[PDB]
Write a protein that binds this ligand. Structure first.
Ligand SMILES: [Zn+2]
Ligand SMILES: [Zn+2]
Ligand SMILES: [Zn+2]
Lengths: 89, 437, 310
């Protein structure tokens, strides 16, 4: 051939996995309510309880981390400070 | 000359009253002598501005400042107006230097002149004022006042620290580099709007790390130490992640070196230097395109992605093209070219078959938008007499049906010749400036 | 941007690089001619000396290898001032480490030590010190490892103070070497002292391998005292840093972290997502996953069965 590649210095980026099948604070599911709410109805008003995402890309219920954040603040799956990056899924 | 006369008058009066009138009348007389003379002196020095406080500080008379500090310290309310006029002169000097009207000023020279003024005033303070707290407080408060007059002031500081960090050509040693950074952060201490400060510094970090290496590789540890001692749990944390990525890049670099040594099932077993970063701290570089890859690099990329997903499992990789470089071995001698992961695809298609055009490289490539032209014009348009990709329809604007050829260009006898069309002027243009604001 | 480096010097440098594959005899002379025709230092000549050192180490030629390394050390101070010059010698230092002539290793180290001291580049001098400190730490040598720590601490001393804010990078490098050193002798009195001296003044950079070691020391100290949360929070980070780096101690501290998460009576699955599957289904780690699974389900009979089984 006329031109042949000898060296390459590509940069590889990566992102964490989440395993969205169950959160770790209550062990019910990523959706379908939490332990503090049980049923869909009974004063939910369109179910004001959604999924919250942190900077570390972990996902739990909004209320579950809220009870977590009052006592501790250290995102029990890593040692990031668990910023707030999203609300809902 | 009055200050020498009043000091002599005070000295002769206190000497006479302590000798001709022993220890009897020394206190009331000297008190009157200091009071009215110093009141005259204070009004004399400030308004004279001819060997006056403004003038005698402008020309740099160390003795005049020194003898005045030792004279005005005796009577109260002397150092108060002394610093007030000193601050007023600093305000006048600051406004004449931070003047924004008029385009065509060198930002690196502007900070250098400002820092020279700070060093000059600090030298005067040490030599004359004997490190008085009141003088230090007034200049510190004043420096907080005339510096934040522009919303671009932290941006100008950020580019200056980028200029001082891109290469230490001025001050090859380290002793003055330590002082030049210490003065930089001291200047940064009396500055507000810290959020915009790192937002450009982080952009400067991206600009200095996503380009050619070999800038410091050691002074990075010094900046973060200064940021840690200056800030808390803030954008310095963004700088923390930036450093982690460099650590992971080299650890994976040697780890991949061991695995390419094992061989056995290596498909693309050629020279690779692959870096690993995290998206959590590097800002948006570009759209991260998904263009094609030449087959030999494809096998090389397939090894790393398979390997990085096996022994570094749990995380998947994403491919991108607006980053990196390469060394294309061409072949009367064998001179290796340079392609910044932009012209690899176009030149590889030429190797398969020459006599292509714009249609060929846009239809059988899955190429992204107009950014292709900027990469494409880097070899043909705006080229000096070192052209590695010539065309028959010589024109400025880009056509569709135009054929590409290659020229030997013996003038570029450089063995590892590089085409550094990118990074022509790192200047932080307005469109990114406004959106980041 | 562009900048004319040099036309001829790069050509003959790479021409001799084509000659190193072709019977390195007379390639060294060609490299030497390039160095002679370079005169003042030389950027291409810096890499040429690096290549000559690499070639001479292949065919066991040490005498001029270190003499040219002294020239390489002097080349560090003037033209290639900060740059990748530390990356070059780190690769040179790692390339010398390939063989087992440990006497030549520390002759090469000690000559490096004094040369970097001259340029006030003690910045590059601790990097050699820590690599020698880590090497001594692996081989359980403390006679000269301590001398390195004392010299580094003295360099860290700001006369009146024994620790510097900007030199906090060297505090952690000193403490990390001391952390695993006293781990060998099980010195709890020193281990707590090292961690306490670390936490406050160290913070300039969480270097992943060093930060994980510092946290791993803290987790052992805290759990040896009784603080479950603090012992939690330390391995709670050490596993993060180890994962990024890739040291074999990733699973070692993860086992400690999983036990620490159990001890604090935590009601949250620690294996959920960061462990994912590589660190949740690793054979011995998966055995630990069954334990915390029984912990969640409060299966006392099953838990004790696994304890006796494994
Ligand atoms: Zn849940
Ligand atoms: Zn709910
Ligand atoms: Zn999380």
């Amino acid at each position: 051939k006329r031109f042949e590649v000898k060296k390459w210095n590509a940069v590889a980026l990566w992102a964490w996995d989440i395993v969205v099948d169950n959160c770790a604070i209550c062990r019910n599911h990523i959706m379908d309510l939490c332990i503090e709410c049980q049923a869909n109805q009974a004063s939910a008003t369109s179910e004001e309880c959604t999924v919250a995402w942190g900077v570390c890309n972990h996902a739990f219920h909004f209320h579950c981390i809220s009870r977590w954040l009052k006592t501790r603040q250290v995102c029990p799956l890593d040692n990031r400070e668990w910023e707030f990056q999203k609300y809902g899924h | 000359v009055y200050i020498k006369k009043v000091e002599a008058r005070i000295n002769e009066e206190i000497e006479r009253v302590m000798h001709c009138l022993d220890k009897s009348t020394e206190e009331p007389i000297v008190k009157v002598v200091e009071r009215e003379l110093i009141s005259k002196h204070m009004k004399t020095i400030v308004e004279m501005e001819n060997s006056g406080l403004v003038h005698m500080l402008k020309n740099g008379k160390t003795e005049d400042l020194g003898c005045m500090y030792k004279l005005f310290s005796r009577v109260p309310n002397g150092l108060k107006t002394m610093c007030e006029c000193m601050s007023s002169y600093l305000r006048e000097q600051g406004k004449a230097l931070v003047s924004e009207e008029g385009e065509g000023k060198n930002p690196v020279d502007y900070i250098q002149g400002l820092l020279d003024l700070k060093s000059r005033f600090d030298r005067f303070l040490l030599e004359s004022f004997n490190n008085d707290r009141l003088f230090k407080q007034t200049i510190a408060g004043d420096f907080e006042y005339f510096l934040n007059l522009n919303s671009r002031s932290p941006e100008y500081l950020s580019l200056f620290i980028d200029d001082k960090l891109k290469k230490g050509v001025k001050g090859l040693t380290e002793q003055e580099v330590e002082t030049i950074l210490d003065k930089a952060m001291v200047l940064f201490r009396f500055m507000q709007e810290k959020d915009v400060f790192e937002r450009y510094y982080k952009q400067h970090l991206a600009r200095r790390l996503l380009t050619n290496k070999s800038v410091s590789d050691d002074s990075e540890k010094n900046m973060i130490s200064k940021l840690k001692t200056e800030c808390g749990c803030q954008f310095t944390s963004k700088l923390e992640g930036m450093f982690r990525d460099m650590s992971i890049s080299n650890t994976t670099m040697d780890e991949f070196r061991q695995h390419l040594q094992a061989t056995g099932v290596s498909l693309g077993g050629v020279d690779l230097t692959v870096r690993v970063l995290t998206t959590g701290y590097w800002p948006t570089q570009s759209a991260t395109p998904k263009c094609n890859i030449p087959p030999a690099p494809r096998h090389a990329f397939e090894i790393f992605r398979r390997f990085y997903l096996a022994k570094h499992s749990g995380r998947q990789l994403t491919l991108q093209h607006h980053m990196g470089s390469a060394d294309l071995n061409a072949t009367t001698r064998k001179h290796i070219l340079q392609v910044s992961t932009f012209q690899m695809t176009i030149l590889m298609l030429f190797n398969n078959r020459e006599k292509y055009t714009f249609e060929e490289i846009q239809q059988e490539t899955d190429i992204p938008e107009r950014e292709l032209v900027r990469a494409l014009q880097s070899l043909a348009c705006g080229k000096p007499t070192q052209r590695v990709l010539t065309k028959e329809p010589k024109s400025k604007e880009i056509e569709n049906g135009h054929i590409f050829t290659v020229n030997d260009q013996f003038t570029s006898k450089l063995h590892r010749v590089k085409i550094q069309t990118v990074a022509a002027k790192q200047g932080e243009s307005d469109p990114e400036r406004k959106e980041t604001r | 941007s562009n900048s004319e480096p040099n036309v001829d010097l790069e050509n003959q440098y790479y021409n001799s690089k084509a000659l190193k594959e072709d019977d390195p005899k007379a390639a060294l002379s060609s490299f030497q001619k390039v160095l002679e025709l370079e005169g003042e230092k030389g950027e291409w000549g810096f890499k040429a000396l690096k290549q000559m050192i690499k070639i001479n180490f292949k065919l066991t030629n040490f005498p001029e290898m270190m003499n040219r390394y002294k020239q390489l050390l002097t080349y560090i101070r003037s033209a290639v001032t900060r740059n990748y010059s530390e990356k070059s010698i780190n690769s040179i230092l790692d390339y010398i480490s390939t063989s087992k002539q440990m006497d030549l290793l520390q002759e090469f180290y000690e000559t490096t030590l004094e040369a970097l001291k001259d340029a006030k580049n003690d910045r590059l001098w601790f990097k050699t010190n820590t690599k020698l400190g880590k090497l001594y730490l692996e081989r359980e040598e403390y006679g000269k490892l301590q001398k390195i720590l004392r010299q580094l601490h003295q360099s860290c001393q700001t006369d009146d103070g024994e620790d510097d804010l900007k030199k906090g990078t060297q505090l952690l490098e000193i403490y990390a070497l001391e952390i695993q050193m006293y781990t060998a002798q099980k010195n709890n009195k020193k281990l707590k002292a090292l961690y306490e001296q670390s936490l406050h003044i160290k913070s300039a950079i969480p270097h992943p391998l060093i930060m994980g070691v510092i946290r791993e020391c803290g987790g052992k100290m805290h759990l040896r005292e009784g603080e479950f949360e603090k012992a939690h929070t330390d391995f709670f980070e050490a596993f993060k840093n180890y994962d990024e780096s890739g040291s074999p101690r990733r699973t070692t501290c993860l086992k400690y972290l999983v036990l620490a998460n159990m001890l604090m009576k935590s009601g949250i699955n620690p294996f959920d997502s960061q462990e994912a599957k590589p660190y949740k289904n690793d054979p011995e780690i998966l055995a630990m996953t069954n334990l915390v699974s029984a912990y969640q389900n409060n299966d006392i009979t099953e838990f004790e069965k696994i304890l006796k089984t494994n």
